[PDB]
């Protein structure tokens, strides 16, 4: 029974931060090619961030590159998303996924999803 | 730049048909893995299903198992989605999905997506 569950999620002004957080349970993280997908209306999906091939080698996005970091923890087996410097564009709901491809299961197992949202205060009145 | 153009959405009638295009850009589906997402409302995506491997192998999930269809067409370059004996359930925004991987790691795109009501 593999099964991600996402937190995290919420309100952010513009420069601010969070940290979406993704648990992993049914298998350990240490052995598949985790990822973060954005999906918000108008613009379908994309892969925001990847650690993958448990050498631990990580892809980001180059709208993302410099302000996100994605992380493991194997104790905890969970995947980790740091987002600083949050941008009106980084608003969507972000879901915590695996590849095309899982090792574990022979079909891709997606989250929930959380949503992030960033608005300034000029956009909130 | 890969893309991969939606297309064959629109409205069916519970136990018809209907058959998803996917036009791909930039690469070659046949040598690929690719899949169909699906978001359903009031619910998060899901893979509907994939074909991967060497083999040419598909998997479908438990919900579409004899149902749909994933195929791949070289001569257009495009990937079908096959989809019969719909379910009210089958109503959601399907998403085609493509893995290339280059320089040794798999990297994912997506579609724009296209829209499947199943109603009377």
């Known amino acids: 029974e593999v099964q991600l569950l996402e937190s995290g999620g919420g309100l952010v002004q513009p420069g601010g931060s969070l940290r979406l957080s993704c648990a992993a349970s049914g298998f350990r993280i240490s052995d598949e090619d985790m990822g973060w997908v954005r999906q918000a209306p108008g613009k379908g999906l994309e892969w925001?961030?990847?650690?993958?091939?448990?050498?631990?080698?990580?892809?980001?996005?180059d709208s993302v590159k410099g302000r996100f970091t994605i992380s493991r923890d194997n104790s905890k087996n969970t995947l980790y998303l740091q987002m600083n410097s949050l941008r009106a564009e980084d608003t969507a709901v972000?879901?915590?996924?695996?590849?095309?491809?899982?090792?574990?299961?022979?079909?891709?197992?997606?989250?929930?999803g959380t949503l992030v949202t960033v608005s300034s205060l000029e956009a909130l009145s | 730049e890969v893309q991969l153009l939606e297309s064959g959405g629109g409205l069916v009638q519970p136990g018809g048909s209907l058959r998803l295009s996917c036009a791909a850009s930039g690469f070659r589906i046949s040598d690929e893995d690719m899949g169909w997402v699906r978001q359903a409302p009031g619910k998060g995506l899901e893979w509907v299903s994939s074909?991967?491997?060497?083999?040419?192998?598909?998997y479908y999930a438990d919900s579409v198992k004899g149902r749909f269809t994933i195929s791949r067409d070289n001569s257009k370059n495009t990937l079908y989605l096959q989809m019969n004996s719909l379910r009210a359930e089958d109503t959601a925004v399907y998403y085609c999905?493509?893995?290339?991987?280059?320089?040794?790691?798999?990297?994912?795109?997506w579609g724009q997506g296209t829209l499947v009501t199943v109603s009377s």
């Open positions: 074909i991967y491997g060497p083999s040419g192998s598909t």
């Open positions: 999905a493509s893995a290339l991987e280059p320089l040794s790691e798999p990297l994912g795109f």
